[PDB]
């Protein structure tokens, strides 16, 4: 069990109907608060660990938005070393309905060190996710 990783929150700007459920709601420790993106499609969020910082990812945990758990199916998690994710690799693909009101934990088996990680949401989701956490260790 490796430590939870910290970084700068990156991703889609804004929120649905300008209510204020921005990407930051996925990193606040509250499973009741969620990201609700401004558009149905294209929403994403994640971390930049910082210039010169690369982590090997060993585990990801996530919690869906309550009542909208199906909006995570088909979402993927990616690691990259370009902020545009053009070099990205998929670390995990959500294929089953996540349980409500809890963190689902998934193992990652990829030895690559990444500066950037993200959740890339499927069409029709508004990016909906309540909490997102990455675990791992500095790349050797």
Q: Which CB atom, from 28 or from 123, has the smaller least distance to Ca ion?
A: 28
Q: Region of 71 please: left (phi>0), alpha (psi -120 to 50) or beta.
A: alpha
Shortest gap between Cβ of 10 and Ca ion (angstroms)?
16
Q: Exposed, middle or buried, 101 (CB in 10 Å: 0-12/13-18/19+)?
A: exposed
Q: Which CB atom, from 62 or from 116, has the smaller least distance to Ca ion?
A: 62
Determine the 3-state secondary structure of 96 from DSSP.
coil
Q: Which CB atom, from 33 or from 112, has the smaller least distance to Ca ion?
A: 33
* Residue nearest to Ca ion according to CB distances in the complex: 33
Shortest gap between Cβ of 113 and Ca ion (angstroms)?
27
Q: What is the DSSP letter of 135?
A: E
Residue 17's contacts (CB-CB under 8 Å, 6 or more residues apart) are: none
Binding residues for Ca ion (CB under 5 A): 25, 28, 30, 33, 130-131
Query: Bridge partners of 44?
Result: 120
Residue 53: how many other CB atoms lie within 10 Å:
15
Shortest gap between Cβ of 23 and Ca ion (angstroms)?
10
Q: Which CB atom, from 28 or from 83, has the smaller least distance to Ca ion?
A: 28
Shortest gap between Cβ of 84 and Ca ion (angstroms)?
26
């Amino acid at each position: 069990s490796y430590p939870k990783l910290t970084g700068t929150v990156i991703g889609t700007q804004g929120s649905w109907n300008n209510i204020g459920n921005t990407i930051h709601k996925a990193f606040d420790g509250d499973l009741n608060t969620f990201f609700d993106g401004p558009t149905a499609n294209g929403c994403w969020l994640g971390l930049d660990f910082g210039e010169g910082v690369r982590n090997v990812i060993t585990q990801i945990k996530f919690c869906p938005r309550s009542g909208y758990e199906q909006r995570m199916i088909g979402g993927i998690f990616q690691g990259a070393n370009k902020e545009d994710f053009s070099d990205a690799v998929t670390l995990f693909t959500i294929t089953s309905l996540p349980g409500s009101g809890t963190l689902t934990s998934v193992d990652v088996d990829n030895p690559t060190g990444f500066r950037y990680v993200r959740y890339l949401s499927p069409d029709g989701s508004n990016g909906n996710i309540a909490e997102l956490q990455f675990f791992g260790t500095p790349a050797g």
